[PDB]
C-alpha cells in the first residue's frame, strides 16, 4: 500500500567550484505523498530550499524536485536528507558529481 | 481549460 | 508532434488537522502550466508558465471557481470511499485522479483519460471509447453506478472531443516557442575505473526536452539491457531534464561499447565512444 521513494542527487549545470550553479535533490517513486527533504552542506541543513509543485506520474506515485542556489568547492560536501513513512530513518545520499 | 464538473461525479 | 494536456487531481485527509488537502497541476507535455493549493493563503489558479499568463482575469475566475468547487466535491467523495471500504475514520487517505487529451501529430483527439485512485490503488477509469468505465472493484462499481445514472462519460466525451482539445491547441500556439520546440541532449562519456581490470562508462543526456529518450549501450553491437545501469529520467529545473546509463567493463575492452542516443530534439541519433 506504501512506496518508498527513489533519491537523486545532482547538478542543473555540470559542476565546476567556484562557478554558481544549483544543487538538486529529486525524489520521486513515493506513496503516500507526505515527505521530508532537506539538502545538506557538511551535514548541516541549507535553509534557503525551494521545491516544485507536487506532482504524480502515471503510476500514481508522487514526484518532487527540491532545489536551491550553490557555489560547489572541492572540499564542501553536499547531501539530501529524506524521510518518509516507508522509512524507519532518515536516508542520507552524498552529492557525487559523476552520478 | 478544466472540466467544468460538478458534485453529480462525487465518487 | 504529438501533444497532450492532462490535469492531475489529489486530495488527502488528514485527521485532527483539518479538512483533506486539495491540490490540483496541470500540464502541457512536461511542462506544468497552472496550479492550485487549498492550503494556500488565498486559493486561487495561478500560473506556472509564462504563455498562460496572457489568459484574462475571466478565465482566472472560472477556473479558481472550477477548483474550489473540486475541493469540496473530493472531500465528500474521501468520506464515501472510508464509507465503501469499511474504514475507521483515524487513517489519513488519498484520492487522485487525471484527465485529459492526447493529440496526434495531425492535432486530432488520438485519445481521451478520466480515472482515478485511491490510496495508490487504480479504482475506476473512463475506457478508451469515452463511453463506458472500468471500475477496479465492488466498491468502485458503486461509483460506476451513480456515474451512468449521472451520464458523466457523456460530460467526459463532450469536453474531451471539444474544450479540451481546443483549449490544448490554443496553449500550443500561445506557447509554440517552447511547447513546440524540442531541445536536444548534450552528450558525453565518462570513464571511471573501479579496479585495476574493470572500469564504469558511463553515458551522459543532458539539457534535452521533451523528457522522453532512450540511451543504451552496445557491446560489439548487442544490446547490453540486463548489464546497464539507468537512472530515472530526471528535471534540470530549467525545464530541461537529465539521465545517463552506464556500463561495467573490462579494462582495454572500452572500444568494444557504443552508446546510443535518440531524442526528438537530435537531427540523427547518436553513437558515442569513449
Redo the contacts between chains.
Keep these: ?3 518508498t521513494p ?1 533519491i ?1 542527487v ?1 547538478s ?3 559542476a565546476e567550484n567556484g562557478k554558481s550553479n ?1 544543487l ?1 535533490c ?1 525524489v ?2 513515493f ?4 515527505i521530508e527533504v532537506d539538502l545538506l552542506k557538511n551535514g548541516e541543513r541549507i535553509e534557503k530550499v525551494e521545491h ?5 506520474s ?1 503510476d ?2 508522487f514526484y518532487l ?1 527540491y ?1 536551491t542556489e550553490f557555489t560547489p568547492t572541492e572540499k564542501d560536501e553536499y547531501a539530501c536528507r529524506v524521510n518518509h513513512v516507508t522509512l524507519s530513518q532518515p536516508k542520507i545520499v552524498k552529492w557525487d558529481r ?2 | 481549460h478544466e472540466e467544468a464538473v460538478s458534485v453529480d461525479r462525487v465518487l | 508532434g504529438s501533444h497532450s494536456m492532462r490535469y ?1 487531481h ?1 486530495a ?1 485527509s488528514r485527521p485532527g488537522r483539518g479538512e483533506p488537502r486539495f ?1 490540483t ?1 496541470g ?1 502541457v507535455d512536461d511542462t ?1 502550466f497552472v ?1 492550485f493549493d487549498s492550503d494556500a493563503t488565498s486559493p486561487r489558479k495561478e500560473p ?1 508558465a509564462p504563455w498562460i499568463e496572457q489568459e484574462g482575469p475571466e478565465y482566472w475566475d472560472r477556473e479558481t471557481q472550477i477548483s474550489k468547487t473540486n475541493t469540496q466535491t473530493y472531500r465528500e467523495s474521501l468520506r464515501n470511499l472510508r464509507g465503501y471500504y469499511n474504514q475507521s475514520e483515524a487513517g ?1 487517505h ?1 484520492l ?1 485522479s ?1 484527465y485529459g487529451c492526447d493529440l496526434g501529430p495531425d492535432g486530432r483527439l488520438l485519445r481521451g483519460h478520466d480515472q482515478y ?1 485511491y ?4 479504482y475506476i477509469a473512463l475506457n478508451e471509447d469515452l463511453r463506458s468505465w472500468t471500475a477496479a472493484d465492488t466498491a468502485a462499481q458503486i461509483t460506476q453506478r451513480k456515474w451512468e445514472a449521472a451520464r458523466v462519460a457523456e460530460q467526459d466525451r463532450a469536453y474531451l472531443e471539444g474544450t479540451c482539445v481546443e483549449w490544448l491547441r490554443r496553449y500550443l500556439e500561445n506557447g509554440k516557442d517552447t511547447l513546440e520546440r524540442a531541445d536536444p541532449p548534450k552528450t558525453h562519456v ?1 570513464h ?1 575505473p573501479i579496479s585495476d581490470h574493470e572500469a564504469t562508462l ?1 553515458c551522459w543526456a ?1 539539457g534535452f526536452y521533451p523528457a522522453e529518450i532512450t540511451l543504451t549501450w552496445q557491446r560489439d553491437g548487442e544490446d547490453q539491457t540486463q548489464d546497464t545501469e539507468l ?2 529520467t ?5 525545464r530541461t531534464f ?1 539521465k ?1 546509463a552506464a556500463v561495467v567493463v573490462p579494462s582495454g575492452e572500452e572500444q568494444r561499447y557504443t552508446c546510443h542516443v535518440q531524442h526528438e530534439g537530435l537531427p540523427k541519433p547518436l553513437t558515442l565512444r569513449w
Design positions: 500500500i506504501q512506496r527513489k537523486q545532482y542543473r549545470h555540470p544549483f538538486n529529486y520521486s517513486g506513496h503516500p505523498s507526505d516544485s509543485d507536487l506532482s504524480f502515471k500514481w506515485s524536485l532545489y559523476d552520478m | 492531475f489529489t488527502m491540490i497541476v500540464y506544468l496550479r506556472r489519513s488519498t487522485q487525471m485512485a490510496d495508490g490503488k487504480d565518462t571511471h558511463r543532458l537512472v530515472e530526471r528535471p534540470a529545473g530549467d537529465q545517463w
